[PDB]
Ligand SMILES: NC(=O)C1=CN([C@@H]2O[C@H](COP(=O)(O)OP(=O)(O)OC[C@H]3O[C@@H](n4cnc5c(N)ncnc54)[C@H](O)[C@@H]3O)[C@@H](O)[C@H]2O)C=CC1
Ligand SMILES: NC(=O)C1=CN([C@@H]2O[C@H](COP(=O)(O)OP(=O)(O)OC[C@H]3O[C@@H](n4cnc5c(N)ncnc54)[C@H](O)[C@@H]3O)[C@@H](O)[C@H]2O)C=CC1
Ligand SMILES: O=C(O)[C@@H](O)CS(=O)(=O)O
Ligand SMILES: O=C(O)[C@@H](O)CS(=O)(=O)O
């Protein structure tokens with residue numbers, strides 16, 4: 004008993020090829036021609052001819068008129084993000100353990116050296132994105148943080164994005180957008196400090212560029228056009244459900260809004276209401292959401308909660324709201340989503356700006372295998388070990404034998420050599436020497 | 440000043456273009472043609488015309504002659520890997536916290552649904568790799584584990600590789616190698632079970648295939664041709680240092696072996712001994728190690744411990760052995776490596792086969808941003824949140840104001856709507872409505 008009351012023509016997969024073609028071309032050009040290729044893209048794409056690296060004096064000049072009340076809101080949001088980041092940092096521990104007697108092994112948890120953070124600016128200026136990356140990197144104890152945001156409307160970095168970067172602790176700020184920003188941070192163009200990890204959200208081109216540069220750099224997650232899903236039962240309020248879908252639909256023409264419900268009445272009311280709310284939006288938002296709802300919006304009626312879980316996990320939405328009775332059950336049973344909003348009171352926009360948990364989140368089904376940007380994306384979990392000579396009697400003979408079973412004679416000789424050195428009178432079966 | 444007593448012509452970067460050209464072509468063919476392309480590659484690259492998925496009966500038949508002693512060694516190794524993996528699992532906790540009053544936020548730690556594991560077989564048959572992936576996935580509580588290894592030496596999967604997969608708990612086993620194996624696991628070809636995460640080591644083509652498919656799937660880490668670095672002071676034994684370098688140089692022509700030392704006498708003796716040890720290897724190993732040492736081997740003399748740390752962190756070796764006095768200091772000060780071997784007694788081959796910590800590890804500098812395969816690579820760290828209505832007074836007004844500063848009116852309306860529903864008599868500043 005599963006019925007599409009609204010089916011989308013397009014999905015997050017639809018625009019893959021378009022993004023990949025552009026990114027392949029631009030990365031090739033930037034690899035070949037470095038800073039010059041980037042300055043050319045900045046000019047042709049973003050109308051930008053000025054300096055790319057902002058000086059401290061420029062940062063101060065460009066934020067000097069940012070009012071106290073704006074700064075207070077941004078500062079409060081930075082605190083909430085920092086508070087939760089520090090809680091997440093405490094959840095991953097170092098340890099050591101004894102395995103075979105005399106074998107000590109452990110886990111070190113160490114921050115990366117350099118992070119590059121992207122904050123988008125195109126349709127809107129992503130003030131909150133600016134602190135989501137930088138504040139988290141600082142909470143992780145990352146020593147160098149480089150931050151980029153696109154020149155905005157043929158001017159420079161939006162001043163509130165700039166304030167957010169500075170207030171959150173960015174060490175270097177560049178007026179640089181899109182693929183060329185992501186590439187510049189990966190290769191250390193302009194700063195001479197190649198990033199270890201590049202993070203942050205953006206359009207399909209930005210997200211693909213990061214996906215492509217994985218390997219050269221670590222990343223947080225594939226964080227492309229915003230997605231919202233709501234699970235609702237008959238207790239939900241259609242006006243609020245509809246509002247919440249429209250809230251993320253304004254992000255752009257490619258943003259999916261998904262409703263999974265056990266109530267046809269709720270589905271019906273929401274489908275009537277969403278167009279009405281969209282029609283009351285201002286121009287830019289109405290442009291985005293009209294196309295997004297039409298092309299990517301879906302409404303799925305389900306017979307049981309179990310069916311809702313199955314569909315929701317398959318969709319693996321960036322953001323998942325749950326407006327139902329018995330919220331404990333939903334927290335226990337849902338397994339694929341970026342960020343979960345339990346109950347009507349919280350909502351995606353709160354998470355976007357100031358709840359505390361990061362908003363930089365998996366899209367296009369990446370929630371099947373990753374959560375969002377967090378301190379965990381900046382910590383390396385490395386292993387170490389140490390042995391007594393006694394431990395090597397067992398460990399070394401097993402190693403020699405398995406190595407020789409595999410055909411790895413030089414491996415086995417490293418065990419032979421220790422056995423002969425440490426225990427010259429011992430006689431073990433170290434495996435028949437490899438002859439080929 | 441840092442002196443290269445042996446400089447390499449080649450580095451892990453040298454063969455990037457070669458690997459990328461092949462992988463681009465094969466992944467295009469498999470995307471377009473599916474199983475047909477995979478069957479074609481299995482035949483053309485690996486000489487294989489047989490069925491690809493093994494039945495339970497084939498698994499039994501192909502392992503029925505594996506001797507008790509071989510099974511006992513493999514079983515011991517699986518236990519060590521499992522023991523350490525369970526300890527790692529305990530190191531990442533779920534939690535919840537109060538942020539702003541009435542805001543509850545938490546972290547859920549959930550295993551992925553399907554993992555695909557690759558165990559290489561080409562120059563050698565990677566028995567240990569077979570349990571490194573599968574046993575770790577099972578320790579993480581992954582419910583479906585798909586495992587591939589290449590047809591080897593005119594037969595199917597090497598029988599000891601197959602025993603390792605079975606004993607470690609693989610649900611599905613495929614006789615399937617290389618790029619076609621990685622792609623089949625990513626797309627769920629032959630099983631109808633697309634992986635959420637694909638893991639495991641291989642040659643440059645395997646590693647590039649995984650790196651390229653990132654996004655479609657999650658991965659552990661870029662785990663390509665094996666690397667070994669040794670840090671040594673004057674207390675080290677050159678015979679053991681040389682043996683350890685040669686141990687990993689046998690992996691293939693592209694395996695780098697690096698010595699970082701403060702002792703000129705040690706460097707000199709190791710440089711004399713390494714060729715002598717290589718000359719005494721059987722043919723496959725001698726073929727690999729001669730080329731590897733010549734082309735990729737490096738010996739670097741440093742004045743101070745601090746210089747050694749700086750160079751070692753820059754190289755970011757998959758494996759790092761430390762044959763020095765004062766091992767505590769090295770543990771405290773080194774920061775970029777895959778897996779650390781403190782003291783002479785343990786050694787890379789032990790970690791490869793049976794110490795416990797995973798051997799599937801970052802190469803080509805990936806240790807700057809990730810540790811190895813571990814249970815952590817199978818867990819998703821997701822966030823959830825829940826609010827009282829009261830919490831939304833602060834959270835909602837900050838959200839509305841910031842949203843409107845960014846130009847996101849629909850976002851702000853979701854806050855407005857809650858404020859009107861929950862607190863109709865409140866009169867907070869919710870920001871100037873966006874008009875454009
Ligand atoms: N997944 C997540 O956690 C989040 C996702 N987002 C998403 O970020 C996106 C922001 O998109 P935008 O407003 O476009 O800002 P953006 O900053 O991502 O993109 C602007 C940059 O892209 C370049 N660009 C645009 N079209 C291009 C083309 N055809 N070829 C090459 N370069 C091109 C521009 O010249 C500029 O440099 C939205 O879709 C939003 O939903 C926002 C926040 C978080
Ligand atoms: N980073 C790590 O943790 C580890 C790395 N390794 C590395 O794994 C590697 C194993 O390499 P192999 O013996 O080659 O086994 P493999 O299993 O990686 O490769 C064999 C497969 O690759 C295919 N292949 C080989 N050359 C090809 C080409 N030119 N075009 C397309 N397909 C091609 C073969 O047909 C076959 O399917 C070694 O370099 C070893 O050092 C081993 C264990 C762990
Ligand atoms: O997809 C996201 O995380 C966005 O909703 C965040 S923001 O609205 O751009 O702040
Ligand atoms: O790079 C590696 O981890 C290898 O040394 C592991 S094995 O020798 O192939 O087991």
Ligand SMILES: [Zn+2]
Pocket residue numbers: 229250251254351352355850
């Ligand atoms: Zn949003």
Ligand SMILES: [Zn+2]
Pocket residue numbers: 414665686687690787788791
């Ligand atoms: Zn090895």
